[PDB]
Structures are given as structure tokens and as C-alpha cells.
């Protein structure tokens, strides 16, 4: 059946080439380019004592949670740099953290193969583990809440999972990746999510159906970071091949590549500005590069981290970008 | 500040104090990354020292060790191998009685050891190499020669010489001045691998300190 699989792959390639009328760069040749997006470190979040692997902004655009290998999940008041909570993890090997959209929960996970759900708002004044989501046979590399009861996780077991937090059971398992799944991005409508894996492919999943709608393959190496465009009709991937790629869901192919000859390091994290014209990517070369998502131009640089920028996030109101890094600091930028 | 802002700042300061205390307590831990391949003596040395990552905590001669057993992670190591970039040493377990077995076991262990040695995150990370099952190796080396694994051996078939050749093959992968491979041969019935790891870690710390002073 390998012949039929190759035939269907060639049919998909032909259908993608039939839609490749004019590249994104040909249509965005006339928009005024952004001049120089010069963000400045407004806050520096100090208090992690190891490499920060994940951060996730709150929906209030003021609180954010960061995950560090020091075994601490810290919730930051990014306006005042106050530490709202410092959650001691059972496993210090956390590499993902998600802040629930309601703000009542935070999630984290990593080499323990568990998504730990933490109740931030309990009658007792401490944050406790509300649920530990076991069932992944590899490390959890990303987790994102759909709501207070549903969270999507990606794992090094090459699968993604949808969980019911109350039952602590996998409602849906999203299989189809052959490499380790490294990142997740939920659509703004949260009806569907994209996952990027070590197989150098991004797969689009229906949350309710539990099936892979589309598979996106432009990257030459492991995809570490994935993020939808703000309207949910596109997403950007960040991989180890020093390139960022924008894939359209409807066009079902890559629309733009965000690469530079002076960048050879891998890409750890990607996020979009509120309008989605800026793609902010975190790199192994210790800084974050800001990309004109429409013109692929390198709009700006966020230098200021002494180690690899492992994570970054834009606030839901678009005011600020927080970049975490292996140097144990989070910086808020404007 | 507001009264509530002032109390929030006080809470943040208490959190910062606890974070500093936790980091101080954590910096006193000697973190060991246990590696190896399947049926090597990883579990044997974990039992001697005493879910995706297993963490063995032990104290030996006033030194607290955190041994991270990550063999359950049946995924791509390079995606999570940087998590252990700052370990004091890697403990690599190799079954000596694996030269005669294919599933070659000893070629797989050598390839894994080479990848760990020449990993960009372990450039200066010393390795406490354990050559496990030396007794089974001695049992099966008198019958079958050390040619099923290494055709280019062309040496004596005695246990000591074959084991020394295997150790030399493993240390040939070091190719680094700032990293040392500490090789010990174990038989699963010796209660001194705790001492071996303690001495290797002491040597690693001493050599790191000497490198700091420019004396190494």
C-alpha cells in the first residue's frame, strides 16, 4: 500500500500546487513595511533559579505563569513583577506550562509524562494539584487548556491527547505523528488545534472529531514551536532548521518562510502580535527576532537574554511580549 | 503603593525568600544522569544506590546525589537531553556480557556512548562509565571470543584483556580534554558502586576546581 500512499501524497502535492497562484511575498509587495519594531525590556521577572522552559500569559494580560527546571511554577504579576504564586512541582523536569483561560487553573508537565493541573483558586490559600493527567508514555512538551475541564497535551510519545480534567481521562487521543510532538496551538475558537512534531510536520486536528484534518510539511528539521495566526486561518511553526514557516489552513500549504542567513540556531518559541503582522520567534542564539509576518522581513530583535530564549508569549491584548530563557529570567517587552 | 499592593509585595518577597532558600538547597545536590541501553546494568546500579523519569536521591559521605534515571523515555533524547546539561556527571551503564548478543548490544551501547560523549550539551561533562555484568562476561568470554563484537580485536581472549579492550573502545569516544571517563567493572554483587560514583564525583569536582584555578 506504499504505492497508494505515495500516489495520494503526490495528489496532495498537486492540489497544493494548483492553489499556489501567487506567494505571500508577491501580494504583500506593496504594503508599507514596518520600520523597526524596537521593543524594550519593561520588566524583568527574576526568581527562577534554573532554565525556564515554558511561560504562558494569562487572558487578563497581566498574570503569567512560568515553568522552570528548578521545580517551581511561578505566577507573575507582570505589571508589578510581583510573584503571585510559587508552585513547587512534584517533578522538576517541567518543560510546558499552560495558564487556564479562566485563570482558575495552571498546568505543567514534562519528563514525568504527566500533565499536572493546579487549582490556583482554592478555599485554602495554597495552590494544589487538582488533577494529574497520566497516560502519555512520553514527556509532555505542550499543554493548552480549552476550558476549566478540557486540556490538550502534546507528548514525546508522538501523540496528542484531549483530557477531561474532572475524570482525569483521555477523552481523545490524537495519533498520527511519527516524531515526538513538541508544541501545540489551539485555535481562537478552540474547536481545532495544530501540533508540531519532530517528524518535521505540523498536523491540524479537530478537537471533537479527534482526527487529523491536515498535515503540513515544509520544515527540514524538528518543529519546536507552533502558533495560530490571530484569526485561526493560519499558523506559524518554529523548528530546529533555523526557519519559521507560515501555513494557511484553507490553502493547506506554507505561505511564507521566516529565515535569515545570519540565523543558524534552532527556534524554540513562536507567537504572533494581536493583529498578527508580527511573528515573534525565540531562538537558540539567546535572543528573540521579530518578523513581519506578511513580508517575512526581520522587523526587530529582542536581545537581552544571556541564554537560549526557550519560550515567549504575547498578551491577549497585545500590549506586551514576555520572553523566558534558559538564563532564568523572563522579560516583558513593549 | 496601596495597602493591598503593599501586602501583595510582601507576599512576593516571602515567595522570593522561599525561592532563594530552595535554590540554595538545590545547589548542594550532585545531579547524576543515568544512561545506558535497555538490558544494561542501569537498574542494578539503581538498586545498588538505593512514569517517564525516575529520580533516585541518596546521600553518601555528606554528599547528596540526585540520580536521574531516564531510560523509560523511549523517545528522541536530543529533545530532552538538554534538561540535564548541568549534571555533575553522566553515569553510563554498559553490559560487558553484551558483546556476544544482538538486539549488537555492545555496538548499540558504543553508539549511544559516542552520542552522549559528543553531545553539545555534554562537552565538559565527565562520565562515570560502569561496565556491568563483569562476572557474566567472564563466564561467556572463556567460551566465545571477543570477536563476535569486535573483529579488529586480534588480542588475547582472557577476561582481563577483553574487558580492557572494551573499556578502551568506550574511552576512545571521549575526545575531549575537559572531560574524563571513569570506568568501573561491576558484577551486580558488589556493594561499592556507591563508593565508585562518590570517588568519581569527588574527582570531577576537584578537577573542575583545578580548571578554575588554571591548574588542570
Amino acid at each position, epitope marked *: 500500500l506504499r504505492q497508494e500512499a505515495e500516489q495520494l501524497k503526490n495528489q496532495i502535492r498537486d492540489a497544493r500546487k494548483a492553489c499556489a497562484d501567487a506567494t505571500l511575498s508577491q501580494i504583500t509587495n506593496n504594503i508599507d513595511p514596518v520600520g523597526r519594531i524596537q521593543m524594550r525590556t519593561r520588566r524583568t521577572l527574576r526568581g527562577h533559579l534554573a532554565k525556564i522552559y515554558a511561560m504562558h500569559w494569562g487572558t487578563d494580560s497581566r498574570l503569567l505563569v512560568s515553568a522552570s527546571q528548578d521545580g517551581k511554577l511561578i505566577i507573575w504579576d507582570s505589571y508589578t513583577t510581583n510573584k503571585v504564586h510559587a508552585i513547587p512541582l512534584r517533578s522538576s523536569w517541567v518543560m510546558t506550562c499552560a495558564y487556564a483561560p479562566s485563570g482558575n487553573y495552571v498546568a505543567c508537565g514534562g519528563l514525568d509524562n504527566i500533565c499536572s493541573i493546579y487549582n490556583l483558586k482554592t478555599r485554602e490559600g495554597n495552590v494544589r494539584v487538582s488533577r494529574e493527567l497520566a497516560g502519555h508514555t512520553g514527556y509532555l512538551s505542550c499543554c493548552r487548556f480549552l476550558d476549566d475541564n478540557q486540556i490538550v497535551t502534546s507528548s514525546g510519545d508522538t501523540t496528542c491527547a484531549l483530557w477531561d480534567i474532572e475524570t482525569g481521562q483521555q477523552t481523545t487521543t490524537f495519533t498520527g505523528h511519527t516524531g515526538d510532538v513538541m508544541s501545540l496551538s489551539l485555535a481562537p475558537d478552540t474547536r481545532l488545534f495544530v501540533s508540531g512534531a519532530c517528524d518535521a510536520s505540523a498536523k491540524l486536528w479537530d478537537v471533537r472529531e479527534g482526527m487529523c484534518r491536515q498535515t503540513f510539511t515544509g520544515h527540514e528539521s524538528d518543529i519546536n514551536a507552533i502558533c495560530f495566526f490571530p484569526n485561526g486561518n493560519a499558523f506559524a511553526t518554529g523548528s530546529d532548521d533555523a526557519t519559521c514557516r507560515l501555513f494557511d489552513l484553507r490553502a493547506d500549504q506554507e505561505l511564507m518562510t521566516y529565515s535569515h542567513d545570519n540565523i543558524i540556531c534552532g527556534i524554540t518559541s513562536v507567537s504572533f502580535s494581536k493583529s498578527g503582522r508580527l511573528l515573534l520567534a525565540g531562538y537558540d542564539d539567546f535572543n528573540c527576532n521579530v518578523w513581519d509576518a506578511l513580508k517575512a522581513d526581520r522587523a526587530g530583535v529582542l536581545a537581552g537574554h544571556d541564554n537560549r530564549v526557550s519560550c515567549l508569549g504575547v498578551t491577549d491584548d497585545g500590549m506586551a511580549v514576555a520572553t523566558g530563557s534558559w538564563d532564568s529570567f523572563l522579560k516583558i517587552w513593549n | 503603593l*496601596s*495597602a493591598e499592593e503593599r501586602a501583595a509585595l510582601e507576599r512576593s518577597k516571602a515567595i522570593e525568600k522561599n525561592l532563594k532558600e530552595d535554590g540554595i538547597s538545590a545547589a548542594k545536590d550532585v545531579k547524576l544522569l543515568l544512561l545506558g541501553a535497555g538490558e544494561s546494568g542501569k537498574n542494578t546500579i539503581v538498586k545498588q544506590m538505593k512514569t517517564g523519569i525516575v529520580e533516585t536521591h541518596f546521600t553518601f559521605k555528606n554528599l547528596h546525589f540526585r540520580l536521574f534515571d531516564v531510560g523509560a523515555q523511549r523517545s528522541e533524547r536530543k529533545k530532552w537531553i538538554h534538561c540535564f546539561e548541568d549534571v555533575t556527571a553522566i553515569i553510563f551503564c554498559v553490559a560487558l556480557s553484551g558483546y556476544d548478543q544482538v538486539l549488537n548490544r555492545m555496538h548499540a551501547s558504543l553508539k549511544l556512548f559516542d552520542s552522549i560523549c559528543n553531545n553539545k550539551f555534554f562537552i565538559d561533562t565527565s562520565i562515570i562509565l560502569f561496565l556491568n555484568k563483569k562476572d557474566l562476561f567472564g563466564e561467556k568470554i572463556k567460551k566465545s571470543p571477543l570477536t563476535i563484537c569486535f573483529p579488529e580485536y586480534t588480542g588475547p581472549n582472557t577476561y582481563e584483556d577483553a574487558a580492557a579492550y572494551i573499556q578502551a573502545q568506550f574511552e576512545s569516544k571521549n575526545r575531549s580534554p575537559n572531560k574524563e571517563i571513569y570506568c568501573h567493572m561491576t558484577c551486580s554483587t558488589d556493594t561499592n558502586n556507591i563508593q565508585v560514583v562518590f570517588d568519581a564525583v569527588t574527582d570531577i569536582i576537584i578537577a573542575n576546581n583545578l580548571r578554575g584555578c588554571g591548574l588542570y
Partner: single-chain antibody, 232 residues
């Protein structure tokens, strides 16, 4: 979560005794602790505050120097050492659970209280109305006035609404102006701006009968308005 006070009783004027608070069911060490007293017929009046970790301690001017608030985190106990017990110190003394971080709900849990009986610049909260008669099912708005703007430059308006039900300890309804407390039905509403505040009850039940108290938390000598009672 429960806070159990002990002590109280009857003392001679000029005497001394220690109030205790047996906290249980919550992370007592992480909460700032208040003593708030209520004279037998008058409204609530904040007495003393000990922060989480005992780093910060505040007192009302009428008890400062003579009263000493202390906590013992390992035994989850809060103390009020009272000295030179004047006749004005007779009241029901309430221990109040309060935690402070962004988004937190201070003054959210109150102890049952113990009655102490003694034998014989501050911001002002004004509740002009009192003992307003209400009819179940219809809306009522309880007004509050502050001598100073409770709105801070940070954007928060540190106005608290408490419901002291008959015979029951106070119960937070709204913590910062227009912020519904946990477990409070979403028919209580808070609004206002600057110095003028109203608490609207949409469809008042028979359980909303009680005295409703203001509280500012802007400047620390926390002051309650004289309660606005609701009666059938």
C-alpha cells in the same frame, strides 16, 4: 476552612487576656490575619492586622500600644494580646482571613467570633441609610460614601461589602468595588466610582436580611461604615 476564636468571657476594666484563633482547613501561614470587633449594638470596627509571615503588623489607633496581635503558624493560631481593657473594648471579636495577591479576595472568611465583655486622617465610610425595609424578590441598592476616593492610581477601588446575617458572623459579598466574592450568588452587584458606592441586590431572598457593611482597604486604618440593616 474554619476559624475558631477563643477567649472572650468577662473581665474587669484594666485587666488583660489573650484572644486565640484556632485556624484549620486552610493554609493559615499564607493569609494575613485581622481582628475585627463589633460592639454589642454598633457596627464592625477593624482592630488589628498581622500579615502573612508576621512581617507587617497594624493596629487601630484606639487599641495601638495596648493590644498586641500575634500568630503562631506551626499551630495555625492567631492571638490578640489585650492589655488595659477599657470598657470600650467590649465587643464580639472576629478573626478575619485575608490574603493579598493580584486578584485575591481579602476578608473572605470570618471566624465565628468570641464576645469580650468588660464591666463598668482615617478614611470615613458613610452608610447614610440604615434599617431599610425590603420586600423579597425586588431589587434594593445599599449606598456607601467615602471621605476619600477609594479608587487608587492602580485602577482598583478598595471598597468591601460584607453581609452580617442575624446571629451569624460577617460574610464577604464584594471585595474590591464590583468584584463578587466566592460562593456569593451573582445577584449581588457592586458599583460606584471615587467616593460614592452602591451595592445592588437583584432579587433579595429571605437570607439577605442582615446588616451590610462597607470597608475601605486603601489606607490601612480600615474603617467600616455603620451597617445598613435590611429588614423584612
Amino acid at each position: 476552612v474554619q476559624l475558631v476564636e477563643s477567649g472572650g468571657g468577662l473581665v474587669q476594666p484594666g485587666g488583660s487576656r489573650k484572644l486565640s484563633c484556632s485556624a484549620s482547613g486552610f493554609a493559615f501561614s499564607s493569609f494575613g490575619m485581622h481582628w475585627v470587633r463589633q460592639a454589642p449594638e454598633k457596627g464592625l470596627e477593624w482592630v488589628a492586622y498581622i500579615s502573612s509571615g508576621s512581617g507587617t503588623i497594624y493596629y487601630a489607633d484606639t487599641v495601638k500600644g495596648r493590644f498586641t496581635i500575634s500568630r503562631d503558624d506551626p499551630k495555625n493560631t492567631l492571638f490578640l494580646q489585650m492589655t488595659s481593657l477599657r470598657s470600650e473594648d467590649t465587643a464580639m471579636y472576629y478573626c478575619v482571613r485575608s490574603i493579598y495577591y493580584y486578584g485575591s479576595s481579602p476578608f473572605d472568611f470570618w471566624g465565628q467570633g468570641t464576645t469580650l465583655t468588660v464591666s463598668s486622617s482615617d478614611i470615613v465610610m458613610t452608610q447614610a441609610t440604615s434599617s431599610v425595609p425590603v420586600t423579597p424578590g425586588e431589587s434594593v441598592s445599599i449606598s456607601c460614601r467615602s471621605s476619600k476616593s477609594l479608587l487608587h492610581s492602580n485602577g482598583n477601588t478598595y471598597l468591601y461589602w460584607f453581609l452580617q446575617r442575624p446571629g451569624q458572623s460577617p460574610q464577604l459579598l464584594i471585595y474590591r468595588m464590583s468584584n463578587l466574592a466566592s460562593g456569593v450568588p451573582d445577584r449581588f452587584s457592586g458599583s460606584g466610582s471615587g467616593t460614592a458606592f452602591t451595592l445592588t441586590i437583584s432579587r433579595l431572598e429571605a437570607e439577605d436580611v442582615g446588616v451590610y457593611y462597607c470597608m475601605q482597604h486603601l489606607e490601612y486604618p480600615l474603617t467600616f461604615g455603620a451597617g445598613t440593616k435590611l429588614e423584612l
